[PDB]
Amino acid sequence: MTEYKLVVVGAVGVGKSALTIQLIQNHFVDEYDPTIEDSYRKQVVIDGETCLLDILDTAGQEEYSAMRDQYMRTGEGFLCVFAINNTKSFEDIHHYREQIKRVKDSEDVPMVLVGNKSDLPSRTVDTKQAQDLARSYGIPFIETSAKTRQGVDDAFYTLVREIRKHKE
Numbered sequence: 001m002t003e004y005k006l007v008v009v010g011a012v013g014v015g016k017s018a019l020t021i022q023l024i025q026n027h028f029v030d031e032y033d034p035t036i037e038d039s040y041r042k043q044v045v046i047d048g049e050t051c052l053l054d055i056l057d058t059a060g061q062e063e064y065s066a067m068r069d070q071y072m073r074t075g076e077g078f079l080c081v082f083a084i085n086n087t088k089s090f091e092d093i094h095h096y097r098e099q100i101k102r103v104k105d106s107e108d109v110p111m112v113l114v115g116n117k118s119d120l121p122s123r124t125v126d127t128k129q130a131q132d133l134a135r136s137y138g139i140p141f142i143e144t145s146a147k148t149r150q151g152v153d154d155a156f157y158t159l160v161r162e163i164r165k166h167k168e
């Protein structure tokens with residue numbers, strides 16, 4: 001069984017670990033607990049194919065820039081999670097995109113664009129802009145909602161699907 005080494009990168013205000021816990025024990029945590037180092041492995045059946053999902057959560061602060069670069073090489077799938085309530089994370093995606101290519105040296109790399117906090121009425125990021133931007137990058141965009149649990153499971157499925165596509 002192949003282990004999929006994925007890294008959940010994001011800024012402060014998106015709630016990265018919130019999605020992970022939903023996949024593990026299906027619990028939506030409201031509190032913001034700053035993670036330092038944790039890896040969650042689980043056996044997920046992707047379209048009938050059981051795969052080992054190794055997802056590591058990162059820090060929202062750019063304090064460990066060197067540490068970020070370290071596992072930026074090992075990370076196969078990059079989760080571009082931004083928040084529609086935080087326009088800053090939207091612009092940060094451009095920075096991460098370039099940084100990823102800077103350590104991968106490839107015009108094509110398994111990546112996914114997902115927007116979280118889509119349950120908040122305070123929308124600062126336009127859905128069209130997010131969709132159009134996704135087309136500009138050429139990656140699938142999944143609307144994720146941690147509160148109503150929408151675009152969560154399907155996001156993981158599409159993720160692995162793209163990885164398999166790029167692979168073979």
Ligand SMILES: CNCc1cnn(-c2ccccc2)c1
Pocket residue numbers: 004005006007039054055056070071074075076
């Ligand atoms: C960096 N120390 C070894 C190690 C363990 N795990 N991963 C890892 C897991 C998922 C995605 C990317 C990397 C790296």
